[PDB]
Ligand binder design. Structure first.
Ligand code: NA
Ligand code: NA
Lengths: 29, 21, 29, 21
């Protein structure tokens, strides 16, 4: 699921699944 | 940033993990 | 969509929609 | 944190915006 173009909610979803309880930061601009 | 690496170019696990806390 | 219990991907989605180009941080633990 | 405010209790716009950059 990670080795593709991922935009918007699709990118946020991948961060959520990969990072797990660590969490993540999403900074588009 | 992440958009350049993962949206306009092909993402990778390696790059995603750069944005985990 | 925000005035409810939101967990996991459902919470990340709400952050994504509300925060827009600002982005957000998701820190579960 | 956010989980306590929005997952185990009812979320709000006000709280969500606390986690925007
Ligand atoms: Na997985
Ligand atoms: Na909206």
């Amino acid at each position: 699921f990670v080795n593709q173009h991922l935009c918007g909610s699709h990118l946020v979803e991948a961060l959520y699944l990969v990072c797990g309880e660590r969490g993540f930061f999403y900074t588009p601009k | 940033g992440i958009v350049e690496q993962c949206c306009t170019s092909i993402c990778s696990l390696y790059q995603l993990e750069n944005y985990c806390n």
